[PDB]
Amino acid sequence: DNETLAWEGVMKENYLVKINTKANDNSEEMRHRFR
Amino acid sequence: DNETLAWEGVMKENYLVKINTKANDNSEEMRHRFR
């Protein structure tokens, strides 16, 4: 029970990280660096 | 036999070069140069 919920929470954190990385993958930050 | 294999190897080298050039054709290196 608790083990399954903790594992699901870990996978949820991974999924959120994946979404954030996909959003940041635009690769426009380089331009900012240039500025 | 050996002639055909050598010719095939030459064409394979050409094909690999073509793939690498297609990959590098992104033309983003200019930005790096600017940096």
UniProtKB/Swiss-Prot annotation, chains A, B:
Post-translational modification: N-glycosylation is not essential for but facilitates cell surface expression, multimerization, association with lipid rafts and ion channel activity.
Species of origin: Mus musculus (Mouse)
Superkingdom to which the source organism belongs: Eukaryota
Oligomeric form and interacting partners: Homotetramer. Interacts (via N-terminus and C-terminus domains) with TCAF1; the interaction stimulates TRPM8 channel activity. Interacts (via N-terminus and C-terminus domains) with TCAF2; the interaction inhibits TRPM8 channel activity.
Domain notes: Cooling agents bind within a pocket formed entirely by the S1-S4 helices that opens to the cytoplasm. The coiled coil region is required for multimerization.
Subcellular localization, as worded in the UniProt entry: Cell membrane; Membrane raft
Record protein name field: Transient receptor potential cation channel subfamily M member 8
Tissue: Expressed in dorsal root and trigeminal ganglia. Specifically expressed in a subset of pain- and temperature-sensing neurons. Not expressed in heavily myelinated neurons. Not expressed in neurons expressing TRPA1 or TRPV1.
Signal peptide range: none
UniProt note: phenotype after gene disruption: Trpm8-deficient mice have severe behavioral deficits in response to cold stimuli.
Function noted in UniProt: Non-selective ion channel permeable to monovalent and divalent cations, including Na(+), K(+), and Ca(2+), with higher permeability for Ca(2+). Activated by multiple factors, such as temperature, voltage, pressure, and changes in osmolality. Activated by cool temperatures (<23-28 degrees Celsius) and by chemical ligands evoking a sensation of coolness, such as menthol and icilin, therefore plays a central role in the detection of environmental cold temperatures.
Family statement drawn from the similarity comment of this UniProt entry: Belongs to the transient receptor (TC 1.A.4) family. LTrpC subfamily. TRPM8 sub-subfamily.
Interval of the full protein contained in this chain: 1049 to 1083 of 1104
